[PDB]
Symmetry: C2
Subunit: 104 residues, 2 copies
C-alpha cells in the first residue's frame, strides 16, 4: 500500500518552474543581441541565432505544457499518469539548459 513517496516528482516540478522563470532573463539577453546582429552584424550569423532561439521557444512551450499536465494529474489524484510528463519535464529542462550553455 505504498509506491513513490519520494521528492523526485516535486523536485522536478520545482526545477522546471525555476528554469521557466530563469529563461525569461536569458531570452531578453539574446533577443537584444539578435537585434544588433540583424541591424549591423553578419546576416548568416544572426540566422543561426534566430533559429536557435526558435528551437528554445518550442522547448519552453513543451516544458510548460508538460508542467500543466503533471500539475493536473496530481490535482486529480493520479500520480501514475504524470510519470510520463515528469520524464518529458526533465527532457525539456535539459534541452533549455543545454542550449543556453552553448550560447554562453
Amino acid at each position: 500500500r505504498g509506491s513513490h513517496m519520494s521528492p523526485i516528482a516535486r523536485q522536478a516540478l520545482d526545477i522546471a518552474k525555476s528554469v521557466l522563470e530563469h529563461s525569461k532573463g536569458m531570452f531578453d539577453y539574446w533577443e537584444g543581441m539578435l537585434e544588433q546582429y540583424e541591424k549591423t552584424g553578419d546576416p548568416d550569423q544572426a540566422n543561426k541565432l534566430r533559429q536557435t532561439l526558435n528551437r528554445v521557444k518550442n522547448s519552453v512551450g513543451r516544458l510548460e505544457s508538460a508542467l500543466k499536465r503533471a500539475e493536473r494529474a496530481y490535482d486529480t489524484g493520479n500520480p501514475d499518469a504524470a510519470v510520463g510528463a515528469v520524464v518529458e519535464l526533465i527532457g525539456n529542462v535539459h534541452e533549455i539548459m543545454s542550449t543556453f550553455h552553448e550560447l554562453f
Copy 2:
C-alpha cells in the same frame, strides 16, 4: 527557491538512491547472454554514469570553476533524464 545548480544536484542524489535501490531489488530476485542479463547491466551502467556525473559535478563545484560547474550540471540533468527515461520504459 534554491539555486538551479543546487536543485540539479539534489534531484540527482534522490534519483541515484531510488534507481540504485531499485536495481538492488531486481538483482536480488532475478540473480552473448540472456536478455534479462543485458537489461540488468544496462541499468547498472546507467546508474554508474549518473553517479560519476554527480561526483564530477561535485568536484567542479569544489574547484570553483563556474564554467565547469555549470557544464557538469547540464551533463548531470542529461543523465537524470536519461535514467528517468529507461525506467519509465521498463515500467
